[PDB]
Amino acid sequence: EPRTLPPSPNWYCARCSDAVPGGLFGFAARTSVFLVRVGPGAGESPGTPPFRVIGELVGHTERVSGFTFSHHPGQYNLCATSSDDGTVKIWDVETKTVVTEHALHQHTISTLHWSPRVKDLIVSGDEKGVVFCYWFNRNDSQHLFIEPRTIFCLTCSPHHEDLVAIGYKDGIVVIIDISKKGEVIHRLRGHDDEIHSIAWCPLPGEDCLGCYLATGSKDQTIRIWSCSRGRGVMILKLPFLKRRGGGIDPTVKERLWLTLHWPSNQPTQLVSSCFGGELLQWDLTQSWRRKYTLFSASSEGQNHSRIVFNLCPLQTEDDKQLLLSTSMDRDVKCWDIATLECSWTLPSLGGFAYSLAFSSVDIGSLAIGVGDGMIRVWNTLSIKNNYDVKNFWQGVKSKVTALCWHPTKEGCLAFGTDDGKVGLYDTYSNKPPQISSTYHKKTVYTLAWGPPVPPMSLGGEGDRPSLALYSCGGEGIVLQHNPWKLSGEAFDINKLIRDTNSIKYKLPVHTEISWKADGKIMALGNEDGSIEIFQIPNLKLICTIQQHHKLVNTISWHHEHGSQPELSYLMASGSNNAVIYVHNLKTVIESSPESPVTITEPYRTLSGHTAKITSVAWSPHHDGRLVSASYDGTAQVWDALREEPLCNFRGHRGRLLCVAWSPLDPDCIYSGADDFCVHKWLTSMQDHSRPPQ
Numbered sequence: 001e002p003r004t005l006p007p008s009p010n011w012y013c014a015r016c017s018d019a020v021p022g023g024l025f026g027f028a029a030r031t032s033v034f035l036v037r038v039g040p041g042a043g044e045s046p047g048t049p050p051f052r053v054i055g056e057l058v059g060h061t062e063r064v065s066g067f068t069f070s071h072h073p074g075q076y077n078l079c080a081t082s083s084d085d086g087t088v089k090i091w092d093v094e095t096k097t098v099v100t101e102h103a104l105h106q107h108t109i110s111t112l113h114w115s116p117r118v119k120d121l122i123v124s125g126d127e128k129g130v131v132f133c134y135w136f137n138r139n140d141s142q143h144l145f146i147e148p149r150t151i152f153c154l155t156c157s158p159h160h161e162d163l164v165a166i167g168y169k170d171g172i173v174v175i176i177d178i179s180k181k182g183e184v185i186h187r188l189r190g191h192d193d194e195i196h197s198i199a200w201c202p203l204p205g206e207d208c209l210g211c212y213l214a215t216g217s218k219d220q221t222i223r224i225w226s227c228s229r230g231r232g233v234m235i236l237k238l239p240f241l242k243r244r245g246g247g248i249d250p251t252v253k254e255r256l257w258l259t260l261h262w263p264s265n266q267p268t269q270l271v272s273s274c275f276g277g278e279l280l281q282w283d284l285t286q287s288w289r290r291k292y293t294l295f296s297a298s299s300e301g302q303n304h305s306r307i308v309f310n311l312c313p314l315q316t317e318d319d320k321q322l323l324l325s326t327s328m329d330r331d332v333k334c335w336d337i338a339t340l341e342c343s344w345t346l347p348s349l350g351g352f353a354y355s356l357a358f359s360s361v362d363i364g365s366l367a368i369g370v371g372d373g374m375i376r377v378w379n380t381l382s383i384k385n386n387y388d389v390k391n392f393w394q395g396v397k398s399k400v401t402a403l404c405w406h407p408t409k410e411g412c413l414a415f416g417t418d419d420g421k422v423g424l425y426d427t428y429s430n431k432p433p434q435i436s437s438t439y440h441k442k443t444v445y446t447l448a449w450g451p452p453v454p455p456m457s458l459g460g461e462g463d464r465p466s467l468a469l470y471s472c473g474g475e476g477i478v479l480q481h482n483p484w485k486l487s488g489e490a491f492d493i494n495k496l497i498r499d500t501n502s503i504k505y506k507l508p509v510h511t512e513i514s515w516k517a518d519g520k521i522m523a524l525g526n527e528d529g530s531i532e533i534f535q536i537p538n539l540k541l542i543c544t545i546q547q548h549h550k551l552v553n554t555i556s557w558h559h560e561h562g563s564q565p566e567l568s569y570l571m572a573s574g575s576n577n578a579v580i581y582v583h584n585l586k587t588v589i590e591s592s593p594e595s596p597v598t599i600t601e602p603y604r605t606l607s608g609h610t611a612k613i614t615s616v617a618w619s620p621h622h623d624g625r626l627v628s629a630s631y632d633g634t635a636q637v638w639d640a641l642r643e644e645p646l647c648n649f650r651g652h653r654g655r656l657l658c659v660a661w662s663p664l665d666p667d668c669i670y671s672g673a674d675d676f677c678v679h680k681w682l683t684s685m686q687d688h689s690r691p692p693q
Helices: 494-501 565-569 586-591
Strands: 003-005 017-020 024-029 032-038 051-057 064-069 078-083 088-092 097-102 109-114 121-126 130-135 140-145 151-156 163-168 173-177 183-188 195-200 212-217 221-226 231-237 269-273 279-283 291-294 308-315 321-327 331-336 341-347 353-358 365-370 375-379 389-392 400-405 412-417 422-426 444-450 468-473 478-481 510-515 521-526 531-535 540-545 552-557 570-575 580-584 597-599 604-606 613-618 625-630 635-639 644-649 656-661 668-673 678-682
Touching: 017 321, 024 064, 024 308, 032 064, 051 341, 078 109, 088 121, 109 151, 121 151, 151 195, 163 195, 163 212, 183 221, 212 269, 221 269, 269 308, 353 668, 365 400, 365 412, 375 412, 412 444, 422 468, 444 510, 468 510, 494 540, 510 552, 521 552, 521 570, 531 586, 540 586, 565 570, 565 586, 570 613, 580 625, 586 597, 625 656, 625 668, 635 668
Parallel strands: 017 064, 017 308, 064 109, 353 400, 353 656, 400 444, 540 597, 552 613, 613 656
Antiparallel strands: 003 678, 017 024, 024 032, 032 051, 064 078, 078 088, 088 097, 109 121, 121 130, 130 140, 151 163, 163 173, 173 183, 195 212, 212 221, 221 231, 269 279, 279 291, 308 321, 321 331, 331 341, 353 365, 365 375, 375 389, 400 412, 412 422, 444 468, 468 478, 510 521, 521 531, 531 540, 552 570, 570 580, 580 604, 613 625, 625 635, 635 644, 656 668, 668 678
16 A cells, blocks of 8 residues: 655644544645545554545645635535635545635735635635635625734634634734624733634533633633623633653744644533643633643653644544644644544655665665655554654754665664765664764765775774765765764775776766675766776776766666576666666676776666656566656656566656665555655556656
8 A cells, every 4th residue: 555755734824734524634735735534434454543645735836824624514525725825725625626716815814714604605814914705606705804913813603604703913812793894893802922723612602611712822821712791711821841752853943832622522621732742631610720631641752742733623434533733843643532642643744855765674664864854764664553753853954865774783874964964873772873074065965885995994903894884975075984983084085096097187076876786896976977887995997887978866786686696787877867777787897807998888778757867776576677766756667677667656746856665565666756755656556657758
C-alpha cells in the first residue's frame, strides 16, 4: 500500500482544518487542502492506525487560510476554502473539483465558516473587518461591515441561523445578526488580546451550568459568555505547566495560540489548547475551582511539543469520538475524547524533501533531508505504525540537502545543509551532532563514505578510521572529512588529484561524487558534464566520460549482489539535460591504464524525461533496473539493460529531488519533491509506462 508523507498544516489560521463524521479530515497545507480518511473506511490492517492520506484539493494559487466542511447530512462531501489568492472556493471532495467560487473580498481573508444551520451558507471575514455571506447554491451574496478591525476568527451559531460570532485582533468579540445587516446583538468586552477561537455551547439554553459561547485568546484566558445578559460568566486562565517530553528548539519563537473545542457529548466540558501544545479538558461544573485535565496525562511522549492551532471533532462510523489537532510541531494528532489518549500521529514536512537515504545496517531506516531544518528518520518497516518517524533538529537549523548513513556503524548519519555545513548525527543518542569545522562555500549536494586518501590515509593505525566522509559543495569542492577529527581541517581532494595526475590546468568544478561499491573506484561528476573515474590509493585518473553536456547531478553504481558479476561495473548518471546514460566501466577499470582513457559513447541511453534529472538509483532486487527522479514531476523506472521504460510515477505535484528503492520490497520506491511530500509508491500500481511527452 502507498503512503504519503504530506506538507505541514498551515499555522496561525483560526480554522484551516475540519472534519466530518465517518469520516474525513481535511487540512490546509500551503496552497492545497489534504484529505485524510479516518475510521473503518481507511481500510487499514487490524494492527495499524485506522487512517489514510487519500487526496488533495488543488486549485488555489496562494496560501489556504481557511477550511470548513459542510456539516449538513447528505452533503458532508461539500467544503469551502479561503485563500490569499482572494477567492473563496466550494469543493466536492468526492470529485476533488471546485463546485463554484467567488472573489468578493478585496482584502486578505482571515477565515470562513460553513453555517451549521443554513445548507449553502458560507460566511467569510477579512483583515479589514469586511464579512461576506455567501449562499453558494442560489448565487446570492451579501457584504456586511461591523467594526473597522482585523477579523481573526468567526463562528456561526449552531442554534440560530442568523447569528454569527466574530473575534478580532484587538480582543473585541461581537455577536451579529446577519439578517439585520450585521447589527451587533452583543458586544462582549473582556479580552485584552487576539481572539483565536470561538466555540458555542452545542446545547441550546443556559441550563447546563439563551445560550453560551466560549472565546479563547492570546491573553491566556478562555471566557464563557451568556447570550442572556450579554456578559461574561466565567474566566478560565491557562495553567502554567512544566514542559513534558519533547526536547524542543529554544531558538524558534512561539507565542500562545488558544483554540477551543466544545464537545457535543459533554456540554459541561470544554477542550482547549495550552502553552507548548498541551491539550486540556476543562470541567465547567467545577468553575470556581478551575478544574482541568491534561490530555494523555498518564502516558508520556504523546503530547504536542509546540502550540496547537486547530481542533476538529470526528465521530467514526464505529462510534469513536475523535478529536484531531494540528500543531506548529508539524504533527497531526488524533485524540480519543473518551479516554483523552492519543490514538495516532501523522507527521508532516515543512519544506522540500531534498534527500533520501536508507541505512544498510538497519534495513528500512529511511533518513529524509527536509527544507524545514529537521532530519526525519522513518522506520519504514514498522509493523504497527505506517508513519513511525522521529525528528532530529539539534545542530541542523538550515535546509538538509544531503544525507548518507555510515556503511556499518548503526545510527551514524552524515548530513549536509544548504549553508554548506557538514555534520555527523548519532541518532541512537540524544547528543547534538558533531559539526565539521570546515564548511563548503555553498550548498552540500552530496555526501559519501569511502576509503581515506592522502593526506588523511597517511597518519597511523589509531589516528584514522576505516572510512572517510566525502562532501561535495555547490562551489565545486570535494572535501575529505575525518569522522574522528571533525574539529580538525577537512581536505580539498583536488590537491591530491592534481599531484597524482600531474595536472597543470585548473581542476573541474565537481558537482557529484559516487564511490563504487567495492570502495576501489571514485567517480566525480562535474559542472561541464564530464564524469571522471579515479582509483585508490591516490586517486589516479583512469577514465574520463564525456557524455552529458550539462552539470552532473547524480551518479549511481550498480550493486554487487546481482546475478552477473560484471553488473557491478555499471554506472548510471543524470545531468541537467533530460537524457540518462549508463556506462560500463569493466574494460577500463580491469585494464588499469597508465594513461587515462576517454569514453564518448554510452553503454545504454535512457530517454523519456522532459526536464533535468536530480537522482538515479539502481534496484537492489534486480539486474540493471534503474529509477530516476526528474524536474518534469515524475519518477521513471527503467530496465536499463534493454533501454525500456517500465513505469512512471506521477503522484508528485512538484519537481522530484530524490528517490530511493525500498530495501525489502522490490515493488516499493520512495521519492521526495519540492511539493513538500515524500511518496511511498508501488511500481505495480503505475499504469503509465513513460513520462508525459
